[PDB]
Amino acid sequence: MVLSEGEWQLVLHVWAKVEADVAGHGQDILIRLFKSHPETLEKFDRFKHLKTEAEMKASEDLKKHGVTVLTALGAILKKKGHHEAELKPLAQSHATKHKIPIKYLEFISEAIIHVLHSRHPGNFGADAQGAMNKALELFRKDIAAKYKELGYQG
């Protein structure tokens, strides 16, 4: 699939706002993921013990990881589709080391959309959300294709 320049502009415009507070956005997104789909928390040996949202909010380690994740996602989005290089190491670790099914990538996509919608209503109207969804679908399709090449496609 291919996004138009106009769609990339809507994506990068809302992402510029997210970048004003990467740590806060990372926290909100991961917590949303873990609360909505608790099964995903089981994949993290380091966070598996967190029992409540309060505990999740207080975790310095979870917050640091959220920053790592958003920074990696941000680099991919800024490539505007030309992310083959950035996708390789990411797909390898998530397929082979962490073993993350595509289904879980859909869950985090939903968490990202939910948080942008709550925090940036003025910059995340219907068109902007459509563009973000298309960007994340492209991301998932390309990761799924790499998963298959690596022997996982899980």
Q: Report the binding-site residues.
A: 65, 94
3-class DSSP state of 130: helix
Shortest reach from residue 40's CB to ligand HEM, in Å = 4
Contact 28, 119 (CB under 8 A): yes
Interacting span for ligand HEM (CB under 6 A) from 4-12, 48-56, 89-97, 120-128: 89-97
Shortest reach from residue 89's CB to ligand HEM, in Å = 6
Contact 116, 14 (CB under 8 A): yes
Contact between 88 and ligand HEM (CB under 6 A)? no
The continuous run of DSSP H or E covering 70 comes out as helix 60-77
Give dist(CA 87, CA 68) in Å, integer: 15
Give dist(CA 93, CA 89) in Å, integer: 6
Length of the chain: 154
Shortest reach from residue 94's CB to ligand HEM, in Å = 6
Contact between 16 and ligand HEM (CB under 6 A)? no
Q: Which is nearer to ligand HEM, 73 or 122 (by Cβ)?
A: 73
Q: Which spans of this chain sit near ligand HEM (rule: CB under 6 A)?
A: 40, 43-46, 68-69, 72-73, 90, 93-94, 98, 100, 104-105, 108
